[model samples]
Every structure is written in structure tokens, then in C-alpha cells.
Target chain A: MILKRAADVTPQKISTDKVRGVRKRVLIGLKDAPNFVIRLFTVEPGGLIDRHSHPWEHEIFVLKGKLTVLKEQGEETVEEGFFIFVEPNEIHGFRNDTDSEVEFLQLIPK
Target chain B: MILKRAADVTPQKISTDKVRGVRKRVLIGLKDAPNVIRLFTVEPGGLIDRHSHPWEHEIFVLKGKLTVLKEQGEETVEEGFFIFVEPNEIHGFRNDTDSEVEFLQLIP
Candidate 1:
């Protein structure tokens, strides 16, 4: 068993030609977690994760600010106090269009 | 793929002989998720699950307070934090104050 403060985890920059202005903190995967991994992501204004797909699904909880999710079907603005579930291999991406940074919790199966 | 407002999910009471004042909302487990998903809600005073389980899980705090117990010790955790529970680890959480505490438990 382990208990951790979110602020204590160091954030790693996730920038590439397709993604920018984003940093992710691996919160729980470093330990002996056998089922899933937990990560916290902070996206600055104008930052985005390029459209992509994955075999694993994702469960996300919005923590701060606002974010616009680009779904293959459409787009939606998700603010704090919301939850999003990304189906397996579903094309999706996220962008922080607001002036402030946006943060959220991302949970994925190991 | 779905987007939902957390407040829209109805919370069901989680009360038993060993637990009380705890309500849980099935946030994302209803769908066709291959892996695990989520649950969230508030726990009031005099609430606790007094046993152990074999599944590893992750918990993230949304608001309020919690006092968690393990085989070795206990700790007071608040909002904006997270906890990891190993498989078969004897653990439990209780809310001793009057204020409502909110948190999300996710697993795979």
C-alpha cells in the first residue's frame, strides 16, 4: 500500500512535433501496482495531444481548468467536475484552449 | 467514447453493518470497458469498510477528508491526493468528521 501527494510527483515534459505544451506525472505506476497505472496531466494553453488511438481504454477525471476533447464523432468542451471514458482504439485527443492550464487524472490498465 | 458530468451520476447508499454514511456512484463501470473503470462519491461520518480485498486499486481524492488504515499504520488523507492499495492488503477508510468527503476509486 502507498499514499502520495500529487504535488510531490515530478512532471515530465511531453512535447513532440505532434504534441506540445503538455507535461505528465506518473503518480502510481512506479510502485507494485498490478492492475493499472495512474497519471496526472497538465496542459498549458494551446497545448494538445495529437489525435491518436490505443488498444487500451482510458478513464479520465477533469481536475482543473477546461479542456476540449476532439473525438472522431465530434468535439466537446469538458470542464472540471466531469469524467470521460475513452473506448479502446478510439481516435481521440485533447486541447487546452483556455488561458489557464488544465489538469486531469488519467487511468489506464497495465 | 463518452463524456459525462460527475454530478449527473446518481449516488447509491453504501450502508451495511460495518459501513455507514457512504454513497457510491457508478461513474463509468456500466459501459463495455475491457479493463476496469470508476466510482465516485461522498462519505459522511461513521462510515467505513472494515475488511480486506484481493484486488489492487487506485483512489483519487476529489474533496473532503479521510482516515485510512492498513495492517501497519494509518494516515489522514485529504483532497487532491491519491492512494494505491496492493492486492490482499488489509485496508479500510473511515470518515470521522461531519463534513462530506468526496473521492474516486478506479481499478482495472
Candidate 2:
């Protein structure tokens, strides 16, 4: 029953190796969501989610600005309203090459 | 490599016993998505899927208004918001009144 604007959620600064200039907000799943977790991410210009692979698939929806998904084959730029599906263990990451902040929604199974 | 407006997606009318006045658009699941990502458009006086499931749900209201039926009670929900449900939860969605209502429903 949680209802609030995406902007209202507090953002947490991300500063880990292979990840930079990004912040994330736990939109859901912190309390008692047992199946999946939903998060909102905002990547500043020149920021990037470095190439990495994980066991869980990612379901991402571009909310604002532009994002370039770096894949093993090549890079693809996606704008607002675009949907990205990253299969499990697939090498993928995100980069905000545009001069503005890029916002997107991410969902992953818990 | 897909980019488009939510409004650009074609909506399919939903007509069933438990659900009415609702339309759906397969945002990203019809192709090769293994996880969950999708959108839905509910018309005025529309109701959502009834019954229950053992999966998960992460929903966001893109527009309009509605009341969600949960095991505890009914919740008043509106646009620019989110709703999450756990596994085996008995829940339902309904658009009591509105000319048009839109939402995002995800399953994982």
C-alpha cells in the first residue's frame, strides 16, 4: 500500500568499484516483499555502471534522459519509455553519456 | 534496443468475467524477456484481474485512480505511485471511477 512520488524517495549515493556517479532508491521490497525488489536509479552525466555479470536477470525501464547500455556485442542508446531486459548472467551495464541526469526503474527477483 | 512512448503502444481490450473495462499492452514480455516487465491501461469503470497467484507483483500507477483490495482491507491508490505484493497474497485491483486509468504491472 505504498504510494508516493518517485522524487519523494530518498536516494543513496553509490560509490563502489566499477560503479560511479549514480544513486539508488529502494522503491519497494525493504519492508516485507518476498519475491522481488524494485529500485529507482539516477545516473549523472559521465557516470556509468561498469560492465558486470550477475545471476539474476534485470528488468529496467527508462524513465528520463538517455542511457547507453553497454553490451558485449555493441552499445545501444535507449531513451525515455524504453524497456531493457538483461538475461541472467549476461554481461551488461549502463552509461549516461548525455549531459543530463538519467533516471530508470529496475526490478530484480529476490 | 526498443524505445517508444507509453501512449504509442497499442492496447488490447480486456473482456472477461472477473475483469472488465481494462485494456492491456505487452510492454516487453511477448518477445524474449525472461523476468517481468509490462504495462496496462484500464478504462473508466474498469476492474483488474481477480483471484490469486503464487508469484510476485510490483505495480506502479502511471495515471488515473483506483482502490486495491488486500487481505487486510481496501487501499486508496492514485497516480505517480507504487504497490508491491508478496507471494501467495490474495489481492485484487479495481478502478471504481475514472474516464481512464493506467498502470504498470510486473511479475517475477
Candidate 3:
């Protein structure tokens, strides 16, 4: 039943290698999360979400700026209005290549 | 490793009531996704109409403010807000403002 804006919630730092500044906000993953978790992330310049693999799939939507997607095979860059589908067990991650910072929303089953 | 820009994809028909001036696109769930993701645009004065479903909806506002009508009452949520509608919860989405509203609906 808790509903609030991202600005109202405190951001938690995501510690990882080469992390100049990377943080996430659990926007709506509390009592209302009957199935999935919704998280908003901001990767500051020179920051990146370390490449990793998972058993559960992830659906991410770009919110602002451009992002460099890291994969096992190669790398791809995407901008706002794009959505990424990281299959289960697929090697994937994200990085901020531009100086403006990168913002996106990631949803996964909990 | 698959991703897409919603604009690069074609539009699709949304099976809903009062669909006038409304547009939808399947962002994720392009056949290989366990969960589904849909991008919707509700033009000014347009609505999705009140409805209920067995499956729940997790929505995120990407653009402007949106008017959500629930059985209990109504509320407005702007950009950067997330909404979770429980299973079988009666709700409707509309954009009463002068500008268009865009939001992402996640089906899990």
C-alpha cells in the first residue's frame, strides 16, 4: 500500500568495480510486490553495472541518457525509449558512457 | 542479449475499451520473455476504461501525469512513480491533462 515518488525515497549505493557513482531505488517492491520488483537506477559517468548472469530474466527500460549494454559476446549502446530483455542465465550488464549520466528502470520476479 | 527501441517497433492493437487516441507497443515479451512489458500512450482526454483482470499489473510512469481510477477512489501519479494493481483490482487509466501521457505496464 506504500506508493511514493523516487525523489521521496533514499538511494542506496551499488558497490562494484569501477563504480564512480551507481545507486538504485526500490520504487515499488514492498507490500505491493506480489510477483516482481521494480527498481530505478542511475549510473553516473564512468560507472557501470558489472557483468553478471542470473537464473531469472530481467526487463529494463531506459529512462534518460544513453547506456552501454555489456554482454558476453559483445556490447551495444541504447538510448531513452529503449527496452532491454536479458534472458535467464545470460551474461549482461550496463555502463554509462556519456557524461550526462544514465537512468533506467529494471523489473524482475521476486 | 536482446534489446529494442520501442520506436523501432510497429504499433499494435490494444484490446481495451475506450481505446480512442490510445496507442500501445509490446516492448518485451517479444516471444521469449517470461514476463511482459508494454508501452502505452494515452492522449489528452483519452482513457483505457475501467476493467479488472485476474493477472496483476506493475506500471511505471515515463512521461507525464496520469489519472488512475480505482474502485475506492481516484489518484494522480506523475513521472518517476510506480503503481502496482493487485489481481482483480478494478482500475482505469486516463490522461486528463492537455499533454499526452506515456507509461510502461509490466505483466508478470
Candidate 4:
């Protein structure tokens, strides 16, 4: 078991292939495991991660800011006080249109 | 790194000495670790545990129902979509007044 404090870990840069000013942090590395990465994302208004999907399931929590999650067939805006679960291989991306920073923590399953 | 679904894991029975209707689930065990037990609690109205503390820190997530967390000097009611933190050696307890099956998930 690992104890993580998102407020203590440093944020890493994860710029999408589409836009700039998209910053992220990996609170913990997956190593060989898949569903155990805590990511903090900061997207400037109007910034986005183009559509994509993975082969695994994941969970997310909005720790500080808000974000708009776009699935292939639907969309949702997650803010503080929200917990979201996304199944394996679900096509998703981010579109930040708000002025405030969009920060979220993601947990990927092994 | 492990993936767990509380809805899928079975809940073990954890009743308080003063009450009879308290149930709990160990979503994950500490094994050799202390700050790593994912406990699911179902307290009937008025059920509670005695005060105690640990030598390490912990975090919690309110996955299902609501809970009233009583710290040493203050108290807070935590419900769904809520997260909390309690450091080692803090005294606390629970008092369930509502009968709606007060539940809480603790990452201790």
C-alpha cells in the first residue's frame, strides 16, 4: 500500500499532441502496474487533449480545479467534490474552456 | 499496485462493544501495513466505536453514505464525494443518529 499526498508531489508536464499550456503531474508511477497513476492536470482555457482511448480502466478525482471530460458518445464537467469512474478502453479527452486552472487526479488500475 | 471495487469485495462484520448493529468491510487489509485498511462501515442508529489513535497517518473517502467524524476538539459530518485526513494518535468516534444505514469507507 502506498500513501500519496497530491499537494506534496511535484507536477510533471504532459502536453497533448494538439495544444500547449497543458500541464500534468504523475503522483506515482505505474512501473509494471497500470491502474495506479495519480495525475494532476492543468489545462488553460480552450486547451484540449485530442480524442484517444486506452486498454485499461481508470478512476479520477477533481482535487482542486474543474475540467470537461469528453467521451466518444458523451461528455461531463468534473469539478471539486466529484468522483468519476471510466471503464477500460473508453475514448476520452479534455477540453478546458474555463479561465481557472483545470486540475484532476487520475488513478489507473493495474 | 492493486485495483479494487468495494461493491465487489465482501464486507466483514465489525460491531462495537456498546452496540449490536455495526457492520464493516475490509475492502483492503493492511497486512503488514497499518495505514492501508479500506474499511466499510455500516452503523445502525447510535452505534459507535471507542476512542483511539494510531502511530501513522491515514486518508479516507466517503464512497457511499454519510458519517460524522469527531476529532479531538471539533467534529465534521462527511458524506458522499468527501475526503478526509486524520493524523496518527488522534482521538475520534462515531455517532449515527439516522437509521438510513450510515456507511463510510475508511482508508486507514
Candidate 5:
């Protein structure tokens, strides 16, 4: 029903005890759709989203650069063309270990 | 949790009188997925005919410029753009350039 560019919105810095050097754009929200939220996350080199788990799942698409998927028991390095699915309550996080910046889209059920 | 590459999944090439040169891949679904996430590639001169459905969906552009076809007019969109199609709204896509246009659509 509507179209929007990423530049049209502001990227809010989301640094916390568990997160670092991460900025997020809420692309699609409640006014846009009723059931899901779309977020674009940009992380600088050495930035990361710390490990955590929840009842909802995450569908992620890497848009730029590469990232290391962190789980308590294992790790997986993925590139731009990779798509990841985080099962409900499965601990996971994204780390930008590469030299360049990393951008990714994450979709979660509302 | 699962991780996958786009090339690892099979793409369904859609070829019809209205839909042409389009390949679609179900990136994440059927495995405890909260919803559906599908990746679509529109080759140069490709298009998916203007159509409508009962449910709504959200789209995010991944690469190249895509011409979005509506019932009456069309709009050109580029990477890092998002499109929200309301329920029963007629919409489609077209690739006017020589390169491919890729994007992801999420359905609830």
C-alpha cells in the first residue's frame, strides 16, 4: 500500500550491555502491516548483537558484507547471499568480524 | 536454528504469458518458521503480471532497480527500499534494465 526508502528513516543506535555499535531501522511496522515487523540492522566492524533467545523466531537476510553467527555451542560464518532462520528460544547473535560494515534484514512475527 | 545460502535452495522458474523470466526461492519456511520469506529474482525484461490476493505482504528490495507495476501506473524502486502491499491490492513487478532485480517478500 506504501513504498519507502531506507534513507527516509533514521537509524537509531542500539548499544546496550548485550549489544554494541549497532544501528537499526524499523522499516515496516504496525501501521504498515498487522502481523510482522521488518528491521534493517547495520553493524560496524567489531560490532555485534550479543547472544540471546526468545519465544519468537527471526528470518534474516544478509544485505552487505559478511557476519559470524554466534551460538553458545557453535559458530558459522556467512556472506551476503546467506539467509538465516533462528528458531524460537534458540540462542543466537550476529557478529561483524569482517573489516567492512555489515547490514542485514530481520523479520519477526508481531 | 538454520543457516542457508541462496544457491543451496532450488528456485522455481516462473514462465507464463503474464509472468516471465522470474525465479523464486523459498528461503525460509516449513521448519518452525513464524511466516514465509521468499526471494525473487526478475531478470532483465522480466515481469510478474499485476495481480491481487486476499492477504497482505511486505517486500524489501535487495539489488538493482525494480519497476513495480500497479493497476494503473507503475513506480521504480531501488535497493534498500520497502514496499507494503495491502490486502486485495493489485500489484506486480517489472525489470526494465539489463541487469537482474532481486528482492525478498515476507508473508504472514
Candidate 6:
């Protein structure tokens, strides 16, 4: 197994429409992944992601800052140190409401 | 993706003859892991694991502890904050002599 910094992996730029207003850096993938990945995202206040879904289920851990999370049924305010598991294809997104940037770790099964 | 303390998962006891004197706690599995696992171990001095291998290779992270790691043909002292990867068939073992217990996170 190889241990690498988040910057070591290639970063994918999301289509602005897909990204909403936040920027992201992907830390791990097929290259170093057996079947998992960790992604870091930087969200600015008022930044948001569109309601989209993927086939793979995921777990998310908030490393810093605050966020306003939206789900199909409702929404909630998430803070640092918060960890949440999301099921596959469950529509969800987050809006940054704090003045500072928010960082999150996204882990997905390959 | 379900973040939990190393203690939240089940702990497995190796046959003492097979355990080599170390106790382990499994943190994640098929229940929370789609394809990953995190395990913790508490080791007393001079503890070691037999040379057995599995089909899946794994990556390991050092959380807290000191250990003497033996790989094929050699050995070295591993410290906290260190990380290593083991191939499916490689042989390895560890010993603790710091007069204290060693803690480790085994990520598979």
C-alpha cells in the first residue's frame, strides 16, 4: 500500500454546473485504491452542489467549517467533526453558510 | 464511510498459540465496509504473528505505538505516524520492548 498526500493524485474539475460553486481536490482513486477513495472539497459561503446521484454509496466526514446540507426529504446544518453516511442515489447536496471555507472527506467504494 | 472509534467493531481472539500474544479489535467490516476494514491491536512485549498470508493485500497506518517489524530477510523499528503496505504473501512480524503497550491501526 502506498501513503500519499491528497495532492499526489490527479484532480478532476467538475463541470461548473455540476460543481455548483465549490472547488474540490480528489485524493485517492483506482491508482492507489483497492476499492476506496477520499476526496477533499473547499466550499465557499453560499456555495452549493446540484442534486445529483451516483451508483456508489458513500460516507462523508466533515473536517472543518459549517455547511447547510439538503436532502430530498429535508435539510440540516452540519458542522465540523460531523460524519454522515449516504446511501446510493439518495439525492443530496450542501450549501456553505459560514464565512470561512469548509473541508470534507468523501470516501467511496470502488 | 461510517466513522467510528476502533472499539465499535467486533474483536477477534486468535488461538493463543496462533495469536502470538497480541489482542486485536476489528473496527469495520462488511457491515460498514463495502470493501475495507480497520482493526486495532494491543501488544505486549515480544509479541509476534506467524507467517501466514491472505488473498487481499492491505495498507496499514500507525496510530500509537512502537514495534519492531520483521519483513522477509530483515527487520526494522517502526514508530508512530509511520505507514506501510504489505503484499499478499509477504511475511512479517513485530515485537514490543518499550516496557509499555503498543497500539496500531490495521487498515485492510
**Which has the greatest lDDT?**
5
lDDT for every model?
Answer: 0.81, 0.78, 0.82, 0.52, 0.87, 0.55
Measured by TM-score, the strongest candidate is 5
Chain B global fold similarity (TM-score) for predicted model 4 against the true chain B: 0.55
In order of appearance, the predictions have TM-scores of 0.91, 0.79, 0.91, 0.50, 0.94, 0.58
Sorted by TM-score (best first), the order is: 5, 1, 3, 2, 6, 4
Question: Model 6 reproduces what portion of true contacts?
Answer: 0.25
DockQ for all candidate structures vs. native: 0.75, 0.44, 0.66, 0.08, 0.80, 0.22
Model 6, B1-108: lDDT tens per residue? 233434444567555554465556654445663444434454554355545455433433333344434444444433222234454544444554544343333344
On the 0 to 100 scale, the lDDT of residue B107 in model 3 is 83
Better of 4 and 6 by lDDT: 6
The candidate maximizing DockQ is 5
DockQ (0 to 1) for model 3: 0.66
Give the 10-residue window scoring lowest on summed lDDT in candidate 6 chain B: B74-83
lDDT of 3 at A3: 43
Q: Worst 10-residue stretch by lDDT in candidate 2 chain A?
A: A28-37
Better structure of 3 and 4 per TM-score = 3
Q: Worst ten-residue run, lDDT, model 5 chain A?
A: A28-37
Q: Name the lDDT value of residue B33 in candidate 4.
A: 24
Residues B36-103 of candidate 2: C-alpha lDDT, one tens digit per residue:
45677777677776567887677887677767888888886777678767677778788777467777
Q: Model 1: what TM-score for its first chain?
A: 0.93
> Could you give candidate 3's per-residue lDDT for residues A27-81 as a string of tens digits?
7665645688778899999887778898988888899999999999889999998
What ranges in model 2 sit over 4 Å off? Answer: A1-8, A29-32, B1-10, B28-33, B71-73, B87-90, B96-99
Q: What ranking emerges by DockQ with the best candidate at the front?
A: 5, 1, 3, 2, 6, 4
Q: How well is candidate 5 docked (DockQ)?
A: 0.80
**Which runs of model 6 end up more than 4 angstroms from their true locations?**
A7-15, A30-33, B1-28, B32-108
